[PDB]
Every structure is written in structure tokens, then in C-alpha cells.
Amino acid sequence: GSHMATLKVIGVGGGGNNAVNRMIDHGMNNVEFIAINTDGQALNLSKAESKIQIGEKLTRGLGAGANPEIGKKAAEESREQIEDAIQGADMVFVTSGMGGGTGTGAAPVVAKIAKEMGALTVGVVTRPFSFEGRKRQTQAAAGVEAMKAAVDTLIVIPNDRLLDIVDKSTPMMEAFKEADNVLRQGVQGISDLIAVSGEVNLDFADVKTIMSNQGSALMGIGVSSGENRAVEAAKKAISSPLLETSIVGAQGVLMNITGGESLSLFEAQEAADIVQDAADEDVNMIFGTVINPELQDEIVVTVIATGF
Ligand SMILES: Nc1nc2c(ncn2[C@@H]2O[C@H](COP(=O)(O)OP(=O)(O)O)[C@@H](O)[C@H]2O)c(=O)[nH]1
Ligand SMILES: [Ca+2]
CATH class of the missing domain: 3.30.1330.20 (Tubulin/FtsZ, C-terminal domain)
Incomplete structure (x- = not known):
């Protein structure tokens, strides 16, 4: 009676969904992807198999306009659709950019639902660049705090760190791919862990012990x-x-x-x-x-x- 854990990666809001698209393009077998957004124009371009538009009654298909309360309410009102997309996952990674309306408000709700659905829940989220200003930073901080309360474990990537890894000409998209590797390599390392019986074997129960709460x-x-x-x-x-x-x-x-x-x-x-x-x-x-x-x-x- 062998176990094979189901791993899902959920992008919430614009930056989360672009991370999902770039991960799908890179090629990620044995992992299922879910795209959640208020913004229908972006969601139409998602490469994920499972797409959930949230908040159409609130936004008419637009994003949340930088209002995290709108992202939060949107997610809460789509709870059943989010549960249905998660059902069966043993592990969920929720990735989102903090500071806007949809990620900041909806990603903590998504994470709370996943942990309630029984999944080991990991958040991988960005903080905004300092050039985006103090208000964006303060909104993101409140999002990070709410994520921390909702997940088992949290990985935060301050986007200001990208400034430390570029030269004056490094394309922005190349920089973003560097941040994407944090999540993608984390997921791939768990996937590889589960798929092989090691000479000194670790398995998903060991991942749960190290990551839970x-x-x-x-x-x-x-x-x-x-x-x-x-x-x-x-x-x-x-x-x-x-x-x-x-x-x-x-x-x-x-x-x-x-x-x-x-x-x-x-x-x-x-x-x-x-x-x-x-x-x-x-x-x-x-x-x-x-x-x-x-x-x-x-x-x-x-x-x-x-x-x-
Ligand atoms: N590293 C990274 N940061 C992103 C990217 N897209 C957006 N961001 C950051 O995420 C924050 C929220 O953007 P977005 O996700 O589009 O907002 P939302 O959809 O309205 O919640 C921005 O203020 C940026 O700091 C991305 O592709 N990569
Ligand atoms: Ca193993």
C-alpha cells in the first residue's frame, strides 16, 4: 500500500499567475496548477488547467484596484469553487505578489481553505519594490502577516533583493525568472523526494514533520x-x-x-x-x-x- 502525494501550485492575482505560467512553460510534470484571479483578461491568458475567476460581481471582471478587502471578499465568495479545485491535494503551494488587492486579500483566504481541505500549505510570496512606495509596502506587510497566520510555512521574497542580482541591463523578465526559481525548485525537490525510494529514505511524512505549523x-x-x-x-x-x-x-x-x-x-x-x-x-x-x-x-x- 504505497502513497503518492498530490502536489498543487496555486497562483493568486497577477504576479502569482505569471509565476504559474512561467512554471508551466518551464515544464513541471506530476504537479497540478490552479490559476485564481479577479482579472478576467489575464485569466484568459493563463496556461493552467484549472482557472477560477473570483469576484466578477464585485469587479465586473477587472482586478481589485489595489484594494485588499475586495480580493478577500472575492475569495470568500468563491470558497466552494476553490475547495473543489483543491480537493485531493496533499500539498498546496500558494504563490502571490503582496501589495495589490487580489494577492494581498485573496491569497490568505486560499491558504486557509487549503489547510482546511487537509493540505500541507506553503506560501511563497513577494514584497513590493521600495520604488512602489510606502503605502504598497504597508499593504503588503499586512498581507504577509495574514499569510503567516493561514499557512503551515511561508517563504517571503522581497522584490528589492532582485536589485542585488541584476546589472544595469538585465531584462526585468529575466530577474522575475530568478525569483520564480525559488518556488519552482522547491516544488521540484519535493516531487523528486516523493518519486524515489532513497537508500536512506525520506518521504512525504518527513516533509510534513518539518513543515507543518x-x-x-x-x-x-x-x-x-x-x-x-x-x-x-x-x-x-x-x-x-x-x-x-x-x-x-x-x-x-x-x-x-x-x-x-x-x-x-x-x-x-x-x-x-x-x-x-x-x-x-x-x-x-x-x-x-x-x-x-x-x-x-x-x-x-x-x-x-x-x-x-
Ligand atoms: N517578482 C515578481 N513580482 C511581481 C510580479 N508581478 C507583480 N509583482 C509584484 O506583486 C505586487 C502585486 O502585483 P499583482 O499581483 O499584479 O497585484 P494583484 O493582482 O492586484 O493583486 C506588485 O506590487 C509587485 O511588487 C512578478 O511577475 N514577479
Ligand atoms: Ca522517497
């Missing part, structure tokens, strides 16, 4: 080869140029290491030690290992960190 989280992946591969991959997995919540202070970690037949005991300890030393806490680890003999010299380290 925890608050802030980090989810990261690193890949390296050659000398010092395990240390390099571990450092990449915990590196957080875009993240509000770094690895520092983590008290619980799920770490999975995947390598080929050459994967050494010593280098697995080295990777585990990198993570614990960066947390600078006594970390409760849940450690796994997968041998994929297709891999020659590459090692992959996946981390989920909570307990902040």
Missing part, C-alpha cells in the same frame, strides 16, 4: 561536481540572496543528498556540517540519501529549513 521556511537546492562538491552544493542550497528568511537560526532541517555510486560517507557528513554550522544552532536534522547511478560526478543537496 512552522512559520518561516527556507527551501533550497544546490548542485556541484569535482573537488569539494558536497560542501559547494550544500552552500548553494542554503544561499539566500533573494530570501527574507536565511538559514541562520534554523532549528530543524530536512536534507537530502543525491549522488552517484561514488557518494562518500565523509562528504555527506561535510554537507550536513555546512548546514548546521550556518544555522549556528543545534539543528534537528532529517537526513536522506539517494544513489542515482546515472549521475557520474554530480552531487545534489536539497534543504528545507524551519524552526526559526
Whole structure:
């Protein structure tokens, strides 16, 4: 009697739906996508299999005009349609940009419904750029607080961090793809975790233990080869140029290491030690290992960190 967890990614509002579209385009098998929006013009362009227009009575098919109360009411009045789209999910990722009306107000409602539908619920949300002004920032902050109350775990990406990773000419869309990778690689790492029986096996119950009712989280992946591969991959997995919540202070970690037949005991300890030393806490680890003999010299380290 084997379990295969159902993973769903739900985009709420404009930025959430664009993250969903870009993830579908990148190719994401075994994951189901849901697009929720007030804005019918955008929703018509969604690539998601399941689309939910919310608030048509309130907005006549427009967005929420920067009013989070409208996003909140829209979501509440579509509760049954949202439940029906979620039903059967074991894990739901809710992604949205905070600061506008639809994401700010509707994403916390979506997350609350998912947790009520029984799903392990993870939010991955942005804060606005400082150039969008103090009022947008204050509205987003209220959204982040409401998300935190509604989810099991929350990953916040301040959009100002994108300014740290661009040069003067990096296209805006390229920058946005960098933020999208936080969610996409997190989801893919859980998917890969569930699909394979590891030599030291982790499964969805381990994901639930590390993520349920925890608050802030980090989810990261690193890949390296050659000398010092395990240390390099571990450092990449915990590196957080875009993240509000770094690895520092983590008290619980799920770490999975995947390598080929050459994967050494010593280098697995080295990777585990990198993570614990960066947390600078006594970390409760849940450690796994997968041998994929297709891999020659590459090692992959996946981390989920909570307990902040
Ligand atoms: N990183 C990122 N930020 C986005 C993107 N789209 C919108 N944003 C941010 O999300 C906030 C809300 O925008 P949007 O989602 O369109 O608002 P809503 O649909 O009215 O809720 C904006 O103020 C931006 O900071 C996106 O594709 N990527
Ligand atoms: Ca497994």
C-alpha cells in the first residue's frame, strides 16, 4: 500500500499567475496548477488547467484596484469553487505578489481553505519594490502577516533583493525568472523526494514533520561536481540572496543528498556540517540519501529549513 502525494501550485492575482505560467512553460510534470484571479483578461491568458475567476460581481471582471478587502471578499465568495479545485491535494503551494488587492486579500483566504481541505500549505510570496512606495509596502506587510497566520510555512521574497542580482541591463523578465526559481525548485525537490525510494529514505511524512505549523521556511537546492562538491552544493542550497528568511537560526532541517555510486560517507557528513554550522544552532536534522547511478560526478543537496 504505497502513497503518492498530490502536489498543487496555486497562483493568486497577477504576479502569482505569471509565476504559474512561467512554471508551466518551464515544464513541471506530476504537479497540478490552479490559476485564481479577479482579472478576467489575464485569466484568459493563463496556461493552467484549472482557472477560477473570483469576484466578477464585485469587479465586473477587472482586478481589485489595489484594494485588499475586495480580493478577500472575492475569495470568500468563491470558497466552494476553490475547495473543489483543491480537493485531493496533499500539498498546496500558494504563490502571490503582496501589495495589490487580489494577492494581498485573496491569497490568505486560499491558504486557509487549503489547510482546511487537509493540505500541507506553503506560501511563497513577494514584497513590493521600495520604488512602489510606502503605502504598497504597508499593504503588503499586512498581507504577509495574514499569510503567516493561514499557512503551515511561508517563504517571503522581497522584490528589492532582485536589485542585488541584476546589472544595469538585465531584462526585468529575466530577474522575475530568478525569483520564480525559488518556488519552482522547491516544488521540484519535493516531487523528486516523493518519486524515489532513497537508500536512506525520506518521504512525504518527513516533509510534513518539518513543515507543518512552522512559520518561516527556507527551501533550497544546490548542485556541484569535482573537488569539494558536497560542501559547494550544500552552500548553494542554503544561499539566500533573494530570501527574507536565511538559514541562520534554523532549528530543524530536512536534507537530502543525491549522488552517484561514488557518494562518500565523509562528504555527506561535510554537507550536513555546512548546514548546521550556518544555522549556528543545534539543528534537528532529517537526513536522506539517494544513489542515482546515472549521475557520474554530480552531487545534489536539497534543504528545507524551519524552526526559526
Ligand atoms: N517578482 C515578481 N513580482 C511581481 C510580479 N508581478 C507583480 N509583482 C509584484 O506583486 C505586487 C502585486 O502585483 P499583482 O499581483 O499584479 O497585484 P494583484 O493582482 O492586484 O493583486 C506588485 O506590487 C509587485 O511588487 C512578478 O511577475 N514577479
Ligand atoms: Ca522517497
